[PDB]
């Protein structure tokens, strides 16, 4: 299909959509949609007592990927920073102390790239790399 559209299996040329957040803890995002059009923007805001790290405003690109970096609302109380949840992914594990771990899976047909499991190390850094749920097309 042309740029910004993806086909039915193999080869209807449907429009690409970027994935919505499964959750955005201790903050909100606007507009709140089930998926986002190419060129659409999502803006993130944190509640009181939280630090917004990552990109406050992100745009959906023609290959169905968001630009910028995963936004997260961090209270700074963990041994490691809040690792966030990249858009399209679901995470399990909500403790960010030394030795704790989180696990990530993607949703629908999204292909996980990066570390599906990450541990909070001694120097305050999460092990591995951030998982990114890529579109199967492109």
């Amino acid at each position, epitope marked *: 299909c042309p740029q910004g559209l993806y086909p039915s299996p193999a080869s209807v040329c449907k429009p690409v959509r970027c994935p*919505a957040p499964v959750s955005f803890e201790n903050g909100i995002y*606007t507009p709140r949609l089930g*998926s986002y059009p190419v060129g659409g923007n999502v803006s993130f805001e944190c509640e009181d007592g939280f630090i917004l790290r990552g990109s406050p405003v992100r745009q959906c690109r023609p290959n169905g990927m968001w630009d910028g970096e995963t936004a997260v609302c961090d209270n700074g109380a963990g041994h490691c920073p809040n690792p966030g949840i990249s858009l399209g992914a679901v995470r399990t594990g909500f403790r960010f102390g030394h030795g704790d771990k989180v696990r990530y899976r993607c949703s629908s047909n999204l292909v996980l790239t990066g570390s599906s499991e990450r541990e909070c190390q001694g120097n305050g850094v999460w092990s591995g790399t951030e998982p990114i749920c890529r579109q199967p097309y492109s």
Partner: antibody, heavy 118, light 112 residues
Framework: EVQLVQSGAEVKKPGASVKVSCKAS????????MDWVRQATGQGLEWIGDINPNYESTGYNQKFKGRATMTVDKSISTAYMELSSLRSEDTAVYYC???????????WGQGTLVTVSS | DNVLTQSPDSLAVSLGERATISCRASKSVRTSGYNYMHWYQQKPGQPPKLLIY???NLKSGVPDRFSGSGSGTDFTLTISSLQAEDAATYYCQHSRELPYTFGQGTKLEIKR
């Protein structure tokens, strides 16, 4: 084009539960959340909650106090709203409503009357 | 929660004349360069119908005698030339945060 078709009217006793269905057609179901909104007679519109079919993740109006449960069945493009511990004040017309890319409710179901009474 | 207050609660307008309805939000609905306020029309026995999105944009198929304006917290819906089919209740709604909330509704009737 896009159509949202709800289940029929219900009558329930106080303390009971009701489950309303909303079948969607004419678009890719997983592109959009499904929302639920209610209206008592001669009264205003109240948002209940939403569900994202991609994740089955939900958001709720806190005023309902966990009494509302939203689910989907993607295989048949249907969303459900279950409201438990019903009170007579829950008597209303219940709508499913679907956002557009501006987060406005561009599409609505026809409404389902739920009457809660002894 | 954001409270939307519409005024007047009802109004009678002669056919052909201008009708204006106001919506005031207790919190700003503006963020990221857009005003997340939408307007709907509702007639008896029917769901609401979306007329105006993001304060001032007409939905396709809506006659251009309808228009919207405002920013921040104060918004207006105008019908430049009231026609008989425009008698209805109008509602504003924000999509700035959760919960989504609606104004209480303004009933527009025909003056005689």
């Amino acid at each position: 084009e896009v159509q949202l078709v709800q289940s029929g009217a219900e009558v329930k006793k106080p303390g009971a539960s009701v489950k309303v269905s909303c079948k969607a057609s004419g678009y890719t179901f997983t592109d959009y959340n499904m929302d639920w909104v209610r209206q008592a007679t001669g009264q205003g519109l109240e948002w209940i909650g939403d569900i994202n079919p991609n994740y089955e993740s939900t958001g709720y109006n806190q005023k309902f106090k966990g009494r509302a449960t939203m689910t989907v069945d993607k295989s048949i493009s249907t969303a459900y709203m279950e409201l438990s511990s019903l009170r007579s004040e829950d008597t209303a017309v219940y709508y499913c409503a679907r956002e557009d890319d501006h987060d406005a409710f561009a599409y609505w179901g026809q409404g389902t009357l739920v009457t809660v009474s002894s | 929660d954001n409270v939307l207050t519409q005024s007047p609660d009802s109004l009678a307008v002669s056919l052909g004349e201008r009708a204006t309805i106001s919506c005031r939000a207790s919190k700003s609905v503006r963020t990221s360069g857009y005003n997340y306020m939408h307007w709907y029309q509702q007639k008896p026995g029917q769901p609401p119908k979306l007329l105006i999105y993001l304060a001032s944009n007409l939905k396709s198929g809506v006659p251009d005698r309808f228009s919207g304006s405002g920013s921040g917290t104060d918004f207006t819906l105008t019908i430049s030339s009231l026609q008989a089919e425009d008698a209805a209740t109008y509602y504003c709604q924000h999509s700035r945060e959760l919960p989504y909330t609606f104004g209480q509704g303004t009933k527009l009737e025909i003056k005689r």
